[PDB]
Amino acid sequence: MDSTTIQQNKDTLSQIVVFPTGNYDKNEANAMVNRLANIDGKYLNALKQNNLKIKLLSGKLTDEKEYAYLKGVVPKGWEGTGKTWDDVPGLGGSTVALRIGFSNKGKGHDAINLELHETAHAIDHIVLNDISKSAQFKQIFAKEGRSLGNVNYLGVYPKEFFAESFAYYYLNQDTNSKLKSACPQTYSFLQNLAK
Ligand SMILES: [Zn+2]
């Protein structure tokens, strides 16, 4: 996106993103907002319309009262790892909650970018009526769903392949080009969705 579109999307995000009370790196929180601002504005305005909040967290997910119910619960695909949601830095779906500082791949999660993956889940569910379960996307997923790797997770769960593809499409020009090369039908699907 051009600098002016980024600023417009950041203004929209000022009424979506909620910053935490506790201590955190303000510059890194701002960088996360900047990355979210690359998401197409139509989706951001629709999240705002639904009063979805992107809660940035100063600590563990399960230390927020609304996620205490996840204390000790093992995420799907994480069985046998000894890890629980207490160790997971982001969640997305009907809500979005994200630990500041944990954006990059490998910061306790496997996504190319935490905030884009989790926000993609919310866009899928809230804005797009679970499009990752649509017949069109199921056909694409059957063909391309392993082509971002993590074959036994992304290749098995279309909601996760959708969220990861969305993150690749919107993070930066490199990941956007990688998605087009590896998953051309997914790329065209996302490009058309934003038209
Ligand atoms: Zn996910």
Curated annotation (Swiss-Prot):
Impact of changing E118A on the protein? Still able to bind zinc. Highly reduced activity on fibronectin. Loss of activity on fibrinogen. Shows a surprising 18% residual proteolytic activity on a substrate peptide. Total loss of proteolytic activity
Record note on what altering Y153F does = Shows a surprising 41% residual proteolytic activity on a substrate peptide. Total loss of proteolytic activity
- Its primary localisation, in coarse terms, equals secreted
Query: What molecular functions are annotated in GO for this chain?
Result: metal ion binding; metallopeptidase activity
Cellular location(s): Secreted
The highest taxon in the source lineage is: Bacteria
Q: Provide the disulphide bond pattern.
A: none
Q: Where is the active site?
A: E118 (proton acceptor)
Induction entry: Expression is controlled by a type I c-diGMP riboswitch; elevated levels of c-diGMP repress transcription of zmp1.
Q: How is its activity regulated?
A: Is inhibited by the chelating agent o-phenanthroline in vitro.
Report the cofactor remark. Binds 1 zinc ion per subunit.
Residue ranges of every copy of the ATLF-like domain listed in the record? 10-195
Q: Is-annotated flag, keyword DNA repair?
A: no
The UniProt catalytic activity note for this protein reads: The enzyme catalyzes the hydrolytic cleavage of peptide bonds between two proline residues
Supply the EC number(s): 3.4.24.89
Recorded hits in InterPro entries, A to Z, give:
Anthrax_toxin_lethal/edema_N/C, ATLF-like_dom, MetalloPept_cat_dom_sf
Q: Which residues bind Zn(2+)?
A: H117, H121, Y153, E160
GO cellular component terms, alphabetically, are: extracellular region
Entry remark concerning the domains of this protein: The structure of Zmp1 is similar to anthrax lethal factor (LF) metalloprotease domain IV. The S-loop of Zmp1 undergoes large motions upon substrate binding and seems to exhibit a function analogous to that of LF domain III, thus contributing to sequence specificity and substrate binding. An aliphatic-aromatic network and the diverting loop contribute to Pro-Pro specificity.
Describe the function of this protein: Zinc-dependent endoprotease with a unique preference for proline residues surrounding the scissile bond. Exhibits a high preference for an asparagine at the P2 position and hydrophobic residues (Val, Ile, Leu) at the P3 position. Efficiently cleaves the LPXTG cell surface proteins CD630_28310 and CD630_32460 at multiple cleavage sites in vivo. Has a role in the regulation of C.difficile adhesion versus motility by cleaving surface adhesion proteins such as the collagen binding protein CD630_28310, and is important for efficient infection.
Subunit arrangement?
Monomer.
Q: Which family does it belong to?
A: Belongs to the peptidase M34 family. Pro-Pro endopeptidase subfamily.
- The name under which this protein is listed is Pro-Pro endopeptidase
Organism from which the protein derives: Clostridioides difficile (strain 630)
